[PDB]
Structures are given as structure tokens and as C-alpha cells.
A paper describes a structure:
The soluble ACh-binding proteins (AChBP) from mollusks form homopentameric assemblies of subunits homologous to the N-terminal, extracellular ligand binding domain (LBD) of the nAChR. The binding pocket of AChBP possesses all of the functional residues identified in the nAChR LBD, and its extension toward various directions of the interface provides multiple means for selective accommodation of the nicotinic ligands. The ligand binding pocket encompasses a nest of five electron-rich aromatic side chains provided by residues Tyr93, Trp147, Tyr188 and Tyr195 on the principal (+) face of the subunit interface and residue Tyr55 on the complementary (−) face. This pocket is partially sheltered from the solvent by loop C, which is found at the outer perimeter of the pentamer and harbors at its tip a disulfide bridge linking the vicinal Cys190 and Cys191 residues, linked into a Cys-trans-Cys disulfide bridge (aka oxidized cysteinyl-cysteinyl ring), a signature determinant for nAChR α subunits.
Co-crystallization of A-AChBP with the (±)-4 racemate unambiguously led to a bound (+)-4 R enantiomer at all five subunit interfaces in a virtually identical position to that seen in the (+)-4 R complex, with only a minor trace (i.e., occupancy below ~10%) of a bound (−)-4 S. Per se, this observation would suggest a much lower dissociation rate for enantiomer (+)-4 R relative to its (−)-4 S congener than the one recorded through the binding studies. Whether this is due to the more acidic and hydrophobic composition of the crystallization liquor used for the (±)-4 complex compared with the other two complexes or to conformational remodeling of the complex during crystal nucleation and growth is unknown. Overall, the DX scoring approach appears consistent with the prevailing presence of enantiomer (+)-4 R in the structure of the complex prepared from the (±)-4 racemate. In all three complexes, the loop-C position shows a high degree of variability with respect to the different orientation of the 3-ring system in each enantiomer associated with slightly different orientations of the bound enantiomers at each binding interface.
Author numbering:
A (entry chain B), D (entry chain D): -8 to 208
B (entry chain A): 0 to 208
C (entry chain E): -3 to 207
E (entry chain C): -5 to 17, 20 to 208
């Protein structure tokens, strides 16, 4: 009837009003600073090792990367907006961290829509699915001990004074690993590292993804 | 000329004169009907366990904000529009290995009751072991489709049939289809209280001899 | 004077047509449109018998005619036509029905508009499509076919036509790996069980063999 | 010097003013007409034959194409703009000619920034570097006389009544040709042609690039 | 605590607005610019002797300085630098002179601006370029070279320099198929027949062989 449709129009109007208040009526978040640093939580879900090229020492992974962070500027009171407690939004409408693989050999291919979820406490969750080619020698992959490769993920432009990274666990989520992959996973870890480079006095933070794998027999 | 003016006026009223639809919510949910028409298994790569399908995916949904009265617009009952002018659902394959390649123009049909129909043709690479494809029983592969970001409380999926449409399947494909089904599934994940919905596409196929 | 005036007249004409008139929203059942299609086949680049895909290079002449693009040349310094970005105008959504890869566009997206309202648009394309090349290494060669038509409009909104059923082969690459034995382009009226309206396509049929 | 700093500020202000006068304050050039035709000068500099594929009869060239033309609407008096005699601008800010290879088999890949130089007399110079795949039978490439291939370049949509082409020379510039290419160049010419096609009563102009090449020994 | 954070954000938003929304057409003969280049070579991924193309992965440090990007930190809560989209600022059109494919960009297009007006931009890239790998399976290895410079500006508008002639090899992939015997980056001044003005490039010269 009318009243059901009216409720739906009101819920839409509340959401449109909330997004307008947050985005159109506030300068966009200029990113973290030394005085206002930000912690980004990263977690990997490895779906498949698609290919290991021993002629070029490149390996191709398919995974999704959970990214979470929290901004005061994205907070609201649900009671002021019809009890809206979260919403979906284009990743282009918000600031997102510039988390980059440090040893890719090809631009990352994006396999999922660029949409994030924002919650009323200001927390953002963004889960890009990706295919990554990275530097990896697959020697030993046809052996019982398998091959080991590693790739670091972190901000390309922010030091540890502006962006800290963490993981919720050092165990990579392997529960959705493709059971009929050409490669089986012996272990996969994701470990926060504090790095010093000779160029720079400031510390840099990365998450090191280490995968040990071999040919499935 | 009046029919053109009426259509231009209708599109202007819907699009230019209404704040853009922010997507479905718990309070304003949406059902998307999905159906597959499989045209070709182009390639089955046993060196990487990837298979490439060509298909078109019929997507239908309905928005109150896209409704109009035909009598107010010269008895226009529907129109074609760029898919960029409207909200579209983020239906995603859960086990692709490459970005989907779009093979058809990004245009939808909107009807006066607010229903939208959008039929993207696609080439998809997905995770699939083709072992057995050179046998009578063939190989079986599966891939799930659903929203990447919305739970079942915002977007429900359904199919009109569990039979994949094979009436357009390429007769000289390298592979013949033994069966193809499309089935709604309700899943829970430990992170989350809400249900998640997918459609599971299951294809059994073998080398054409 | 004259060259400055011809420029000024053209700028004025384009402004009058584009900036000062609501844009054509496409055809409808009440206001249907004829689109003429013709193919010029330049090259069969590749025939892959491991996947049954063939790659063609061709250009597709598309013609249609709109009242809203008409003008009187006498009101615009005897300008009888002009070139314009295909993004400035409506263009038909003509699609191959059995491609296996996105079409690669090889020419600039520019159309010619004439004072009688006729539009001509000639996109050059590389297309991979479903094709079994069995027989290509024989005297009789192989035969493949691909249908082209609107993706979203029925025969009640867009009627598709050809000026001839002969594909233009006068630009076919003489040192191609493949020679063309015949190439035809034929209008077809199709009924599908989903739908009461007729659908129109042009069926491109190419018979070819190794040179 | 403070005067030196002031001059620099003024030169910047003058250039911004000039670009604003030309671009923001004038209807954009709608292209040539039968009454107001345009001559484009083309020259090719061939850098490399990268690949000659005899399984598909496609050859891949890397070259840059100098394009020059002149518009009355891009003229200014240097004395009105602090003696600015030219400027660099994004090729997206100006009209550029639709010069197209007639027998490419793949979209051209652009290897250089899309920036042109405009001079006060209204002349424009634009030098896109490109990788082109085109139709070419490389039979004979492993012989003393080598293989010969040809590709025509011209407007896709304008006849010779609206766009004329010319070359300053019929010799392709070979002074940048890669000395350790897989292929050596025996000759490379660029020749203006006036062509009649049965479709069309107006004549069409192209520049025919003819390259004779063989495997380097 | 929260107020300080809001103020630091407001100061940065204000600084970016002052610099960008409330004010560079590129260098000119009257207002020339020096760009410093340095290369960090990460991997020789592939050396194709059938086409004489080699593929490198590296990052290229670019540095330059503009008066129009200067500010006083004391007027903006002691902000001494900030990160910004490379689309918000002018960037130099530094181009490889002998690429055979469009460069693939491997890093986000974000730069760091410092209060003295200096900009640092470090694009990571995969480049295919013209290179004969003959001798790569020998002790002396192969040598290839590629020049980088502006595509549209002469030495009257853009000068280049390097901070060192040694390419940074400290990030070179230890299990690459190729080992680096040497890698240098050298400024060159060129005169061409077409043109009276000088042209500047940085010549990257790499000697490499199969890891054995
Ligand atoms: C994090 C980062 N981004 C920009 C360039 C590469 C890198 C990481 C590798 C070493 C140098 C580096 O530069 C500055 C600090 O660290
Ligand atoms: C749709 C989706 N979104 C982001 C994470 C991955 C995935 C898809 C694979 C299974 C878990 C999942 O999450 C919740 C629902 O389904
Ligand atoms: C033109 C078209 N539209 C979108 C779906 C696919 C197709 C073409 C293949 C057969 C069915 C079809 O649908 C209805 C009419 O024709
Ligand atoms: C330049 C051009 N434009 C569009 C189609 C192809 C071509 C070139 C090959 C012959 C015909 C042609 O058309 C008109 C005259 O020239
Ligand atoms: C820098 C540059 N720009 C565009 C064309 C190619 C090149 C570089 C190779 C020699 C000629 C050249 O032009 C002028 C001087 O330098």
C-alpha cells in the first residue's frame, strides 16, 4: 500500500541526506599526517596460485585483501538518519589507502567492484579481489618441500609516522583456496614488519605475505 | 516529434530531477533475477586449471523510483538507456581469474512499472580443473555469482528456472555440454549474522567427438 | 572573408543542431528507424583451430537518417555536410552475436552528417568470433558465419537493411594468409521463444581457404 | 633578483592569460571545410621493426610521426603577451587531425605524452610515438633484397577537398633507427598519393609508407 | 586530543585549498626547471632475442621545485609536507626514447610536496625497450641502454640531473633470471640536426648476464 512505499522513500531520503552531509558538506579527508596517523588492518584470503613461470620467475596469485580503517569524519548518529547504521559507497567517493605490492611485475588486475562499506562509528571496510603477478622463483615446486615466495604490501607514499599497518592474525585465510588448483599450499603467513631503508631515517611498515607451495599430486 | 519530446521529458524527470538512487538497503531491499545463456566454452587450460566461458547474463530488478504513469507521457511504456545512467547491481563471479570482458553494449531497458532488464554478454575466465573432459562422463566445473558488497538483507537473488539456456550454444564448439544448472544458495559466514545469496552455475562438459 | 565565414557558419550550424536541441533519444515503436549496414573485409588475420576462433579486420558502414539533423544549406553558407565526434550523436548499438573477445576499434570515432539528415559512420574493427576453420587447407575451404544486429532494439524499432548482399572485397589484403572464396551479408528476420517481436540481423558468411 | 622573480610571475600570468584567451574565450575549431581546407604535413622517423610474424602476416613498427598544421584561430601577437612566441599544451585542448593507418590489425599503442607545441603564427606541431601492427607478408626477409611492406596513412573521414597531406621529403628519417634491431632497413619512403575510390567522387589523399627490410646478419 | 586532530586535518585541508584552488603552466624559456632523476632497478624480467626487446621493472625518482608550491609551516600548524594525487599538480613528461610498448604503471600516482616547494614523485614501471641480449649467456654478458628525457621540452625549458651516476641496485631481485654486472645513469646534452636548441637526457646503461 502507500505506507510501505512511503517508508522506502523515507529510508532512501535519509540515506541520500546522510551521504550528502558526509560528502558534499565536508571537505574530503586529506589523508593521514604525523599528527593524525591512521592504522590500517590488512588480511589476505588466498584463492588460487594460477601460474608459476620458471622462465621469468613470475608467479600469479588470485586473492582478496580485506582493508579496514576508521575515520572520525565518517561518524554519524543513526538516530539522526532513520537508524541507518551503515551504507555502501563507491571507493571513489572516499579516501582509500594506497596499499601496494612492492615486487609486482604487472599492474594488478581488479576482479571485484570498487565499493566499500561505511559504518556509523566511522569504520570502513574494503575488500578488493585481485590477480597479482610478482617476483618469485618457483624452484623446488616439483618437490616435497615445495617453493617459497614472498611479497610485501604497504603504502607507497606514507611512512610509519602516518600509516601503521596491522593484521588480525598472521595466518592467511586458506579456507577458500581452490581445491583443484595446480598448486597446493603448504603454508601462508602475513606478518607486519618495521623496515629501515638506507635512503630514509623514518620507519616504514609493510605486511609480508609468505607462501610455500608445491605441485598438487 | 511529440513522442520524442515525451521520452526526453520522461528521462529528464526520472534522471535529472531526482537525487540518484543510493542503492538498496535493509529497509528498501531489492530482488535481482539472474539467468544464464551459455554460448561457448572457448578454452579449457589444463596447465593452469582455468576455463573460459562466453555467455550472456540476464539481470532483472525493479525500483519504485523508476516508475511512471504512461498516460502522463504519451503512452510510453518503456525506453532504452545507457547502463551508466542508472544504478546496476554488482553481480560478481566469486572465482574468476581475470577481469570479465564485456562483449555487448552497456544498455538497459526500463519499463513503466520500474522494472529494469540488462543483458551483458561476457567472457569469463574462472577456476576449473578440466580433468575428465576427454572422457564420456566429461568434466564438471562450478562458479558462484552474487553481490560483492550487499547481503541477502539488501539484495536477494532468484532464478526463473534452474536450467541454463543452452539453445544458443555454439554447435561447433570444441566442447559439448552434458548439463548446465543455475541454483540459488543461501550461505552464512562466521563474521556476519546476515545471510548471503549466490547463484551457483554448474556445467558438465566434454570434448566434442 | 569567405574562409572565416565558412568556419563561422559551421560553428553556428553545429551550435544550432547540438546545443540548441534536445538530443535524439533513439528509435521507438512509434518512431522506428532504418539502419543500413555494409561490410568491407580487409583481412582474415588468424584462424585458431585449437579454440575455434577466427579474427577478422573489416570496416562496417552504418547509415541512418534523422529529421533532427536536417538543415537548409542556404541558411549556412552552402554547407552541405560536416564531420562530428560519434560521442556528440546517437549511434546504433550494432553488435556481433558470437564474438569471443571485445571488438578492437581501429579507426577514429567520427561520423559525417549531411544536410538531409543522413549520418554515415564507418568504424574499422578487429573481431574474434566463433568459427571452426576445418577444411581451410582444402580446395573447398572453410565456412564461417556471424550475425550482427541491435543488442536492445527489436525489428519494430530498428529495421536493418543492406544495399547489397555482396560484401565489398575490393580492399581485401592480397597477401593475406587466407584467400576469400565468397563473402555475403544477408538480412534475416528471426523469432525467439522469449519474445513476440521479430528481431533483425545481418548474417555475414565468409568462405575462405589457405592461400 | 626581485625583478627576476617578478618577470617569471609575469611570464606565467601572460601564458595563463594567452591560453585562456585562445581556449576558454573562443568556440573550438570545428575542423576544415571545402571552403577552408587544411594542409597537414607528415614525416615519419622509423625507430625499429620489432617483429615480423609470418604466421599471421603482421609486422610491428615503432616510429614517431611528425604532424604540422596551421590555424588562424591559434594566432596571437607576442607583443600583447610578454613576447611569448610559443607554448606547450595537452593535445586534448586542441583539435588534432584524424590521421589513421589504413591497414592496421591492432589499435595503435601510444608511446609518448599527448602534448603539442603551438606557435604564435598559429602553427601546431605534434609528434606521437607509436607502435603499429599492420598487414605485411615478410616472405623474403631472410634474403638479400629482403621483404617489402607498405601502409597508407590519411584522414579517416575527410576527403582531399578538406584535408590535404604533404611531406617535406619522400625519405623517411632513418637516423634514429635501432642499430641492433633484428631487421635492417634497405629503404624507407613516404609518398603522398591522390586516390579515387568508386564509392566517392571526391579524391582522397594518403601518405604511403614503404619499407624494405631484411634480417640483420 | 580529538580537537588537535581536527585542527591538524583542517590545517592540511586549508593548505591544499590555498595552493590548488586559490592559485603553473609548466616551464618556459623564461622560467626553466631542473628535474633530478634516479633509477632503482628491481628486476630484468625477460630478454627476448627473437625481437630484441628487454623488460625491466624499476622505479624512477623524479624531483623538482616550484615557488608556487612553497608555504610557511608556522602558518599551517607546522605541516612541513603532504601527499597529493599527481593529477593535482604539474608533473614532467619524462619519457623513454626507445620503448617498444606503453609503460605499465605499478604504483599509485601520488607525490610528496615539501614546504620549500620541492616535489618528489616515484613511479614504479615495467618498460619494454630496444635491446639486443646477445652475450647474456656469457661471462661478459650483454649491454643495453635507454635514454630518458622530456618529449616536448628542450634544454632551454627543462634541464635534467642525477644525484649519482650509480643506479641503485640495493633492491634488485636476488633470484632474478639475470644478474646485474653494472648499471649507470648519466646526464647527456644532445644536439640534433632538426633543431638549434640542446636536448637533455639521462642515459641508463645496464650490463647483465644469466644468473649461473
Ligand atoms: C615505500 C616506498 N615507496 C616509494 C619508493 C619505494 C619505497 C619502498 C622501497 C624502498 C624505498 C621506498 O621509497 C621511500 C621509502 O621506501
Ligand atoms: C561476496 C564476497 N564479498 C567480499 C568477500 C568475499 C565474498 C565472496 C567469496 C565468499 C565470501 C564473500 O564475503 C561475504 C559473501 O561472500
Ligand atoms: C539481440 C539480443 N538481445 C540481448 C539478448 C541476446 C539477443 C541476441 C541473441 C538471441 C536472443 C536476443 O535476445 C532477444 C533478442 O535477441
Ligand atoms: C579513408 C577511408 N575512410 C573510410 C573508409 C575507408 C577509407 C580508406 C579505404 C578506402 C575507402 C575510404 O573511405 C572513403 C574513402 O577512403
Ligand atoms: C625529445 C624528442 N621529442 C619529440 C621527437 C623525438 C625527440 C627525441 C629524439 C630526437 C628528436 C627529438 O625531437 C626534438 C629533439 O629530440
Amino acid at each position: 500500500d502507500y505506507k510501505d512505499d512511503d517508508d522506502k522513500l523515507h529510508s532512501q531520503a535519509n540515506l541520500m541526506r546522510l551521504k550528502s552531509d558526509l560528502f558534499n558538506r565536508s571537505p574530503m579527508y586529506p589523508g593521514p599526517t604525523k599528527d593524525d596517523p591512521l592504522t590500517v588492518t590488512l588480511g589476505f584470503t588466498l584463492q588460487d596460485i594460477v601460474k608459476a613461470d620458471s622462465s621469468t620467475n613470475e608467479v600469479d596469485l588470485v586473492y582478496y585483501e580485506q582493508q579496514r580503517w576508521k575515520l572520525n569524519s565518517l561518524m554519524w548518529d543513526p538516530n539522526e538518519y532513520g537508524n541507518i547504521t551503515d551504507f555502501r559507497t563507491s571507493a571513489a567517493d572516499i579516501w582509500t589507502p594506497d596499499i601496494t605490492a612492492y615486487s609486482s611485475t604487472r599492474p594488478v588486475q581488479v576482479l571485484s567492484p570498487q565499493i566499500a562499506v561505511v559504518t556509523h562509528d566511522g569504520s570502513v571496510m574494503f575488500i578488493p579481489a585481485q590477480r597479482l603477478s610478482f617476483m618469485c622463483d618457483p624452484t623446488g615446486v616439483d618437490s616435497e618441500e615445495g617453493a617459497t615466495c614472498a611479497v610485501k604490501f604497504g603504502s607507497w607514499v606514507y611512512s610509519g609516522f602516518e600509516i601503521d599497518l596491522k593484521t588480525d592474525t598472521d595466518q592467511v585465510d586458506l579456507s577458500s583456496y581452490y581445491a583443484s588448483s595446480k598448486y597446493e599450499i603448504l603454508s601462508a603467513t602475513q606478518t607486519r614488519q618495521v623496515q629501515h631503508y638506507s635512503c630514509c631515517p623514518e620507519p616504514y611498515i609493510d605486511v609480508n605475505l609468505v607462501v610455500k607451495f608445491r605441485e598438487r599430486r
